[PDB]
Write a protein that binds this ligand. Structure first.
Ligand SMILES: NC(=O)C1=CN([C@@H]2O[C@H](COP(=O)(O)OP(=O)(O)OC[C@H]3O[C@@H](n4cnc5c(N)ncnc54)[C@H](OP(=O)(O)O)[C@@H]3O)[C@@H](O)[C@H]2O)C=CC1
Ligand SMILES: NC(=O)C1=CN([C@@H]2O[C@H](COP(=O)(O)OP(=O)(O)OC[C@H]3O[C@@H](n4cnc5c(N)ncnc54)[C@H](OP(=O)(O)O)[C@@H]3O)[C@@H](O)[C@H]2O)C=CC1
Lengths: 292, 292
């Protein structure tokens, strides 16, 4: 009577946490094992370490439609976490022929691509159209900054840890951003995937106490270190000198200058911390303590 | 009272295991934090995960001689696990000026380079600098990492067992040493402050893991109950190293055709499993079970 979940992209940053959260949540957890992983000592040891935690491995290849069909027949629910976004179209074809899947959560976990208007959003929307054209019930998990990419570095670029003296502030740094521990995004995902309340819904991950401006985040760290940092404000115009990964920038712009993560309300029936209040999500003062 | 150990190369395949073995052995454990790691989400989270287990991080760079001196002045013992092998020469210079280091274990762990393409020259060149500087050492040698040679039944281009076919090298009756990387790490952690191994080579040659390739294959066949289709590759055929990545071959040749890991006996006073009989090392029938 356990839900059976196949995780596609199980050795990625988000993928490995979704695997563990599915196990932790009591699901019968299956991980897609792709042949290319056979030469990667990192991927191999991760996959087999899941086996010790009680997961099962299913060998399949995206270029072998029948192995995908055969993999998805063994489960009730499929989650993908890739970033190769469009390889999910082959997954949709498999799910459609198999016929037995109760829910597919595609590889979202970022800004809601339906709210933009770059090619990251196009490709997730292309995957969404196929999901819906095939009549596959779905849940889209959206709306958060990964703490590892945006909080641990106080939203500076080119680094993943907090800076020593100086920090760039974007605008007045008073634009609200949503900073979430990837583990919590994973736990929210593992709880939502068989929840009747969220079938065919978008679930917004917006834990209330993690709705913070860059300056509030910076001040969380100054309080932890006792040292104030040397701040340098950067304006929309100066920033938009992007003259490549010009696309990362400008995802950044939408988050930190336009407030795309917070410029719209979300109901309690569609917000993960309200849906799953027993998830004691990591506040950002806790998340940052590891760096002291 | 604890030995203070600095692990260099602490996010590597072997280095991460050594970090954990040192902590598990009760050593006050330090890990070098190189600046280049700052953009790699993988290395960063490994590094900081060690802090939760009680380890400390030391920031230093191989191009900053005085940062390396500041690092080693904080510990009693340095262990390196690198594979770039000649960056250890800068480490030797720093240790030499520091003056406080009681033992250095260089990045060895594989074939003994004192017998015996440039892998060996570089390791021998590191040993020479160590001994010239009069730095006390222990050289841990003599084993095949299971993940690279046992999990794949010693085939190439893959890290998991093959489904139907296997290449056998010669008759496959040359004795080889297959060792779980975790046991190499635990032996290293137990030996680095052992008075018995100061200025010695310690051979990691656990008695029951001295196996021919055919014996390794046969362990697998008894676990699966499937006989593999075997193809014998002769010593002369193999030396078609046509493809100048070819030193990886040839290393293989010395192990599997010439038996260089097992052709000289070793005394109990210099073999890891006799020096540390409380280490219940993983046998290959147990190691291979995870792949069933
Ligand atoms: N704060 C934010 O806004 C963040 C949001 N995200 C979102 O995370 C989601 C997942 O990304 P992430 O967690 O970072 O993980 P990764 O980018 O590290 O995903 C790695 C896994 O993706 C699989 N993969 C990638 N390309 C292919 C391909 N062509 N063919 C087959 N498999 C492939 C492989 O799975 P396998 O293990 O089976 O080999 C690989 O292990 C994305 O949707 C992204 O938008 C992530 C970045 C920041
Ligand atoms: N069965 C056998 O015979 C085998 C034996 N080995 C031996 O294992 C020992 C450890 O190697 P391995 O685990 O494979 O190493 P890895 O390639 O996994 O890397 C380990 C660390 O090396 C550091 N590193 C690599 N290059 C540089 C460089 N130019 N400058 C600074 N740092 C560098 C990095 O340190 P950091 O983590 O700090 O960022 C890296 O993480 C080797 O001596 C190898 O000969 C190798 C495979 C199997």
């Amino acid at each position: 009577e356990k839900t059976r979940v196949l995780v596609v992209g199980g050795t990625g940053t988000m993928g490995r946490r979704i695997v563990r959260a599915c196990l932790a949540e009591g699901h019968e957890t299956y991980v897609l094992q792709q042949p290319e992983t056979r030469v990667d000592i990192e991927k191999v040891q991760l996959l087999y370490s899941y086996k010790r935690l009680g997961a099962r491995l299913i060998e399949a290849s995206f270029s072998d439609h029948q192995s995908l069909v055969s993999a998805v027949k063994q489960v009730d629910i499929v989650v993908a976490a890739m970033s190769s976004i469009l390889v999910q179209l082959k997954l949709v074809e498999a799910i459609k022929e198999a016929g037995n899947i109760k829910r597919f959560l595609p590889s979202e976990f970022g800004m809601d691509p339906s709210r933009m208007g770059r090619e990251t959003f196009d490709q997730k929307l292309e995957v969404r159209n196929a999901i819906e054209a095939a009549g596959i019930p779905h849940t889209y998990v959206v709306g958060a900054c990964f703490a590892a990419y945006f909080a641990g570095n106080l939203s500076q670029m080119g680094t993943l840890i907090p800076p020593k003296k100086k920090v760039n502030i974007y605008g007045d740094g008073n634009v609200k951003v949503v900073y979430v521990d990837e583990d919590d995004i994973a736990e929210y995902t593992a709880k939502t995937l068989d929840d009747p309340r969220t079938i065919n819904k978008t679930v917004y991950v917006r834990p209330t106490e993690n709705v913070l401006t860059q300056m509030e985040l910076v001040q969380i760290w100054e309080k932890l270190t006792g040292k104030e940092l040397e701040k340098t404000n950067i304006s929309a115009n100066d920033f938009l000198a992007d003259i490549p990964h010009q696309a990362g920038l400008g995802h950044f712009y939408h988050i930190f200058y336009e407030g795309c993560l917070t410029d719209h309300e979300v109901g309690d029936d569609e917000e993960a911390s309200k849906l799953y209040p027993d998830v004691k999500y990591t506040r950002m003062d806790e998340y940052l303590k590891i760096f002291l």
